[PDB]
Write a protein that binds this ligand. Structure first.
Ligand SMILES: CCCCCCCCCCCCCCCCCC(=O)OC[C@H](COP(=O)([O-])OCC(O)COP(=O)([O-])OC[C@@H](COC(=O)CCCCCCCCCCCCCCCCC)OC(=O)CCCCCCCCCCCCCCCCC)OC(=O)CCCCCCCCCCCCCCCCC
Ligand code: HEA
Ligand code: HEA
Ligand SMILES: CCCCCCCCCCCCCCCC(=O)OC[C@H](COP(=O)(O)OCCN)OC(=O)CCCCCCCCCCCCCCC
Ligand SMILES: CCCCCCCCCCCCCCCC(=O)OC[C@H](COP(=O)(O)OCCN)OC(=O)CCCCCCCCCCCCCCC
Ligand SMILES: [Ca+2]
Ligand SMILES: [Mg+2]
Lengths: 114, 77, 100, 45, 537, 145
């Protein structure tokens, strides 16, 4: 219960996110989107998936421009639109007795001290 | 001179523990709203005290009719 | 006053009989759609031929869009499209409502 | 001399943090002059 | 050292562009003071009886007189008649600078000392008490003892002579510096209007100069010019004053006519209907607005034949104005309309207010009808609902329409529209109830009123308050526009037609405009029109 | 321009157009210009869509700003209510009203001018007169304190 509560609290906190965290996330995402491709099979799979789902493959310049435009206000808006108090889907397997009911799980998606 | 030499766009700011200015700038509206709610509750719970009625409520127009005394000349002994 | 109703129709058909420049075609086409005069079948057909000649596609669909906008009711537009369908199918013209 | 204007003829430099207080104070005093004007005629009364 | 450059670019500079901005700023700083004066006087009459004051009637007279004088002679005339003319007329005529730069520089600086001396006069022990139209016996040393109204007389004198001196160069500039191939008939309507106002003002104001000087001499030289026992007739003073006052409002409102006739076509993408008929009817108005002056003396007690002669001709003024309104109505229909634009909003709102004000003006042009409304609140409603609805709206529209050309910035459309709506609602609910207050038979210029009038005054006070928020929003939007660094293209009000390609229009269609000013860069060069533009002869 | 242009080059053009650099724009315009020379029957639907969007689109010159009318309406409402509230708040600081503003005196005057036939036609001395007459009503004529 403590783990779920803290996870959902850190989820809900994203509506007041700071600039430094956003910058770090942007840098990490930009690095990770390129560090994955390290073999011919991986590059072919990436190209195929990008062409099958979108219709074109985004050049690194377009990806860089799209990522760089993101600021903390956009993150706050998106979080308040979808991460704030909203319906969730849960799935549990194993010794999940310690898990509480649905309402107690859902109650942690919003912080009352704001 | 710089906290991160490879990226000068990173400056530390005065703080106590986590009371950095940006957090307080974000927090201020919450304090304002909470204070307004507390004031509204206090005003609600003391709307029948005679001093409040004779000082604040009656001079307010429209609503001032309700918070009066309607007893005619037949009144307190 | 100046030109009457049908005289400008004949004059603009004659002008659109021979246009080789995109700018002149657009200029005359703009100046035609301001007299409350919906072009006749010969005028629109010759404008389509001129657009084919000066090698510009979007002007052709803009013709039908502007005619639909200018016409008062749906019945006149339906009659126009019924009588001009073969041309559009001959020149490979796709209407706006079917384009997307 | 052939200078190109920078599309800035404000008669005085403007920017966010500092000049706002000066502009607002000038506006306030030129708004509130009539006040001292009406007070002057009823000073010795 | 830019300080020398600073003061040479601003004080020791005679360029037309660097002066009209100061005209606008001076108008603004006068208008704020006048609006606060109007707010205080309207808050006084919120409820019957002495209110916020110790029943000081002389203070109320000072307040009303100051509001009237400063807002009629320091807000609208200098910030509309010559402010948008000296900057713009050389652009439309085809000249690089005005005829006489030194007199253009001189005319502006006669006004600041006038404002300071008027404030000093109002700051005396008594202050002016004759109102906007001061009258000799009241102004006589018998009533006022001190340097209170003499300075107001001097301010009116010097402001009038400066305005006359600020209009001599304009006529020469637009009569001799015309573009090669620009016939006087083919002149744009705005400059036509501004020249008509210039000639009318120069022709009429000298009369005010002489009459005001001779009336003022009564206090010092003890002349019998207007003394009842000295053989003077104050009806002569009224005739002299109203040979000026009647055409003054027309010469103030004609720039609004021109700016509306300029705003309508460009934002409507349609040429103005009947230019020649409109300009000839406006010329008929200009000539006509001089022989009628005694409508302000209907209840003084003049003869029957003179009253009939000068009351019958009051009606004929309406016909050309109605023709103008009908022409603008015809221009609006048919062509495209972008009703969301702020200048379009102001132009549209101008017409209905001006026509209802004109109807109110034609209500009380009869000696049989004026007796029930002379010197009552009905004339106040008429003249306010014409002045503040036409001249103020024209000034706001002109500012919001030509501001990028003055500076090169973009304002906030949302805030500007909100300000327009708030101001419109406030001014509509301010002068509305006054119609009923004057229809009941209650006079004007009275700090106290009989008890059966409180409701309409209460209804007016809230709108008076609302107008102040409108002013605050306008101040905020002006500041934001000044410090928003929002760029502007050469001709922001040019859009592709229905059959202009997105690649053909951008490369073979730019640099075209209905008027010259939109051809140049929005911050205009110091030395424009190096060569004269030549049209088809 | 003879070979068909690849589909992944002319898909979702509106989203990409702003970010896409100038050189790709000139290349696409030149390629489409060379393409339109052929008879239009041989062309695909996406080519026609791209051509029309390039010519009679929303980008470039005819890209106007959109103003939220709801924002204007709400701002006007807020300004009106702020003005009303501020006037009400600064209203109470006025001088005390004259003693004649009481219901009792208003009704006394109402019954007074009836006697001297002051406006009996359709006013203060009408035959029925259910109306007020010389009473403003509401806050203007409060009860005696
Ligand atoms: C004032 C009203 C504010 C309500 C307080 C509140 O929501 O909890 C505190 C809540 C702190 O929690 P949070 O970090 O905002 O996130 C709330 C989560 O939903 C986390 O919520 P959760 O699902 O984990 O459950 C916590 C919630 C669940 O509690 C309940 O459901 C209440 C049950 C009834 C008990 C008495 C009421 O507990 C409370 O609301 C506190 C009850 C206090 C117990 C007895 C009080 C004795 C004296 C104090 O906010 C405050 O501290 C309120 C004051 C803020 C001042 C600034
Ligand atoms: C601001 C500009 C302005 C304008 C445009 C007008 C327009 C007119 N004014 Fe007014 N007027 C003033 C400013 C103005 N006035 C001022 C400041 C005063 C007070 C002076 C002071 O005391 O200091 C004043 C006072 C004033 C009086 C004095 C009343 C009194 O105090 O006793 C009179 C009386 O004749 C008058 C008449 C007119 C007339 C006939 C017009 C006409 O121009 C109106 C014509 C317009 C129309 C009528 C509408 C359009 C026409 C049509 C739609 C055609 C069809 C109409 C009909 C057939 C009904 N004006
Ligand atoms: C220039 C003409 C003009 C203008 C604009 C005004 C504006 C106003 N006037 Fe005034 N007024 C007169 C001319 C004018 N007046 C005259 C001649 C008299 C008679 C004097 C005499 O009797 O001696 C008079 C007298 C007069 C009285 C007489 C008092 C009495 O009889 O009891 C009253 C009272 O209601 C009044 C009210 C107002 C109000 C409420 C406004 C305005 O508040 C209405 C709304 C307007 C605004 C609130 C201002 C908006 C400004 C802007 C948004 C700024 C734009 C700035 C620029 C970009 C440069 N006026
Ligand atoms: C209102 C009625 C009062 C009388 C009218 C006269 C007003 C004062 C005189 C102003 C000159 C009129 C134009 C002359 C033609 C002209 O233009 O002279 C030319 C110049 C401007 O042109 P320019 O050199 O740039 O031409 C370019 C050459 N190629 O003028 C002047 O430098 C005016 C000189 C400065 C004087 C201003 C001070 C005015 C004092 C007023 C107080 C005295 C009168 C008091 C009355 C009670
Ligand atoms: C006090 C109120 C009393 C009103 C009494 C007035 C009655 C007569 C007015 C009607 C005359 C005009 C009608 C057009 C007839 C016509 O068909 O004109 C012919 C033209 C047709 O176009 P064309 O020239 O290109 O034809 C070319 C031929 N080869 O029309 C027009 O261009 C109309 C364009 C301008 C008219 C716009 C009207 C705007 C409002 C007018 C006044 C509204 C009054 C509001 C108060 C009631
Ligand atoms: Ca009062
Ligand atoms: Mg009178």
């Amino acid at each position: 219960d403590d783990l779920v509560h803290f996870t959902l609290q850190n989820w809900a906190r994203l509506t007041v996110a700071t600039r430094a965290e956003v910058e770090r996330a942007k840098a990490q995402l930009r690095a990770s989107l390129l560090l994955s491709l390290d073999s011919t099979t991986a590059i072919a799979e990436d190209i195929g998936r990008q062409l099958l789902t979108t219709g074109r493959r985004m050049s690194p310049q377009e990806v860089d421009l799209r990522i760089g435009q993101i600021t903390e206000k956009d993150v706050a808006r998106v979080a308040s639109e979808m991460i704030w108090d909203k319906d969730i889907a849960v799935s549990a397997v194993g010794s999940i007795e310690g898990l509480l009911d649905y309402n107690r799980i859902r109650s942690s998606i919003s912080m009352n001290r704001w | 001179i710089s906290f991160f030499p490879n990226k000068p766009m990173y400056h530390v700011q005065p703080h106590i523990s986590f009371i950095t200015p940006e957090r307080t700038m974000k927090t201020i509206p919450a304090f304002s709203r909470w204070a307004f709610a507390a004031v509204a509750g206090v005003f609600v719970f003391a709307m029948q005290v005679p001093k409040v009625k004779t000082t604040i409520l009656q001079p307010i127009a429209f609503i001032g009719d309700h918070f009066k005394d309607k007893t005619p000349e037949e009144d307190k002994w | 006053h100046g030109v009457s109703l049908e005289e400008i129709n004949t004059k603009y058909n004659d002008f659109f009989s021979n246009v080789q420049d995109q700018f002149e075609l657009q200029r005359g086409l703009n100046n035609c759609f301001a007299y409350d005069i919906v072009p006749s079948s010969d005028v629109i057909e010759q404008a389509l031929r001129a657009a084919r000649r000066v090698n510009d596609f979007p002007t052709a669909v803009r013709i039908f869009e502007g005619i639909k906008v200018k016409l008062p009711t749906k019945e006149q537009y339906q009659a126009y499209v019924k009588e001009l369908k073969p041309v559009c199918n001959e020149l490979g013209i796709v209407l706006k409502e079917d384009l997307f | 001399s052939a200078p190109k204007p920078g599309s800035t003829i404000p008669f005085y430099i403007n920017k966010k943090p500092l000049p706002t207080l000066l502009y607002f104070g000038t506006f306030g005093v030129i708004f509130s002059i009539p006040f001292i004007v009406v007070k002057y005629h009823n000073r010795n009364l | 050292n830019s300080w020398w450059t600073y003061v040479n670019r601003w004080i020791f500079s005679t360029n037309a562009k660097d002066i009209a901005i100061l005209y606008l700023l001076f108008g603004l700083v006068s208008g704020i003071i006048g609006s606060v004066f109007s707010f205080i006087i309207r808050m006084e009459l919120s409820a019957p009886g002495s209110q916020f004051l110790s029943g000081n009637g002389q203070l109320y007279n000072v307040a009303i007189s100051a509001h009237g004088i400063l807002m009629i002679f320091f807000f609208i005339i200098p910030a509309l008649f010559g402010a948008f003319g000296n900057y713009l007329v050389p652009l439309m005529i085809g000249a690089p600078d005005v005829a006489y730069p030194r007199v253009n520089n001189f005319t502006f600086w006669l006004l600041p000392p006038a404002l300071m001396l008027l404030l000093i006069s109002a700051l005396t022990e008594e202050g002016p008490g004759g109102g906007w139209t001061v009258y000799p016996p009241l102004s006589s040393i018998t009533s006022h003892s001190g340097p209170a109204i003499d300075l107001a007389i001097l301010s009116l004198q010097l402001t009038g002579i400066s305005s006359t001196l600020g209009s001599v160069n304009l006529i020469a500039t637009m009569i001799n510096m015309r573009a090669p191939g620009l016939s006087l008939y083919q002149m744009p309507l705005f400059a036509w209007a501004i020249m008509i106002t210039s000639i009318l003002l120069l022709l009429t104001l000298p009369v005010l100069a002489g009459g005001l000087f001779m009336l003022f001499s009564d206090r010092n030289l003890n002349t019998s010019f207007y003394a009842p026992e000295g053989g003077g007739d104050p009806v002569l003073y009224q005739h002299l004053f109203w040979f000026f006052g009647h055409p003054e409002v027309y010469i103030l409102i004609m720039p609004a006519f021109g700016v509306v006739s300029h705003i309508i076509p460009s934002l409507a993408h349609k040429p103005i209907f009947g230019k020649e008929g409109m300009l000839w009817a406006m010329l008929s108005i200009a000539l006509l607005g001089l022989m009628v002056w005694s409508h302000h003396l209907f209840t003084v007690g003049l003869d029957v034949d003179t009253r009939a002669y000068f009351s019958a001709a009051t009606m004929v003024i309406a016909i050309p104005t109605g023709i103008k309104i009908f022409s603008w109505l015809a221009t609006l229909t048919g062509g495209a309309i972008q009703w969301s634009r702020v200048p379009m909003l102001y132009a549209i709102g101008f017409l209905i207010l001006f026509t209802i004000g004109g109807l109110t003006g034609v209500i009380l042009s009869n000696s049989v009808l004026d007796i029930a409304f002379h010197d009552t609140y009905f004339v106040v409603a008429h003249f306010h609902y014409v002045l503040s609805m036409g001249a103020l709206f024209g000034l706001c529209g002109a500012y919001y329409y030509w501001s990028p050309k003055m500076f090169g910035l973009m304002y906030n459309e949302t805030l500007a529209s909100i300000q327009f709506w708030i101001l419109f609602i406030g001014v509509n609910i301010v002068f509305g109830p006054q119609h009923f207050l004057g229809l009941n038979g209650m006079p004007r210029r009275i700090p106290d009123y009989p008890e059966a009038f409180v409701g309409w005054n209460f209804v007016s006070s809230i709108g008076s308050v609302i107008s102040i928020l409108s002013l605050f929003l306008f101040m905020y939007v002006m500041y934001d526009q000044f410090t928003s660094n929002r760029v502007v293209k050469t001709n922001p009000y040019l859009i592709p037609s229905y059959f202009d390609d997105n690649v053909i229009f951008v490369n073979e269609k730019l640099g075209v405009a209905q008027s010259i000013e939109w051809l140049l860069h929005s911050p205009v060069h110091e030395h424009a029109f190096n060569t004269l533009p030549t049209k088809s002869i | 321009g003879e070979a068909m242009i690849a589909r992944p080059r002319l898909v979702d053009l509106d989203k990409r157009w702003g970010i896409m650099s100038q050189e790709e724009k000139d290349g696409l315009i030149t390629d489409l210009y060379a393409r339109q020379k052929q008879p239009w029957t041989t062309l695909s639907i996406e080519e026609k869509k791209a051509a029309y969007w390039i010519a009679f689109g929303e980008h470039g010159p005819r890209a106007f700003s959109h103003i939220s009318q709801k924002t204007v309406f709400w701002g006007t409402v807020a300004g009106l209510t702020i003005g009303v509230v501020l006037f009400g708040l600064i209203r109470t600081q006025a001088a005390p009203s004259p003693r004649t503003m009481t219901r009792e005196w208003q009704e006394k005057s109402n019954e007074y001018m009836k006697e001297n036939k002051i406006n009996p036609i359709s006013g203060e001395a009408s035959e029925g007169f259910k109306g007020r007459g010389q009473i403003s009503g509401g806050i203007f004529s409060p009860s005696e304190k």
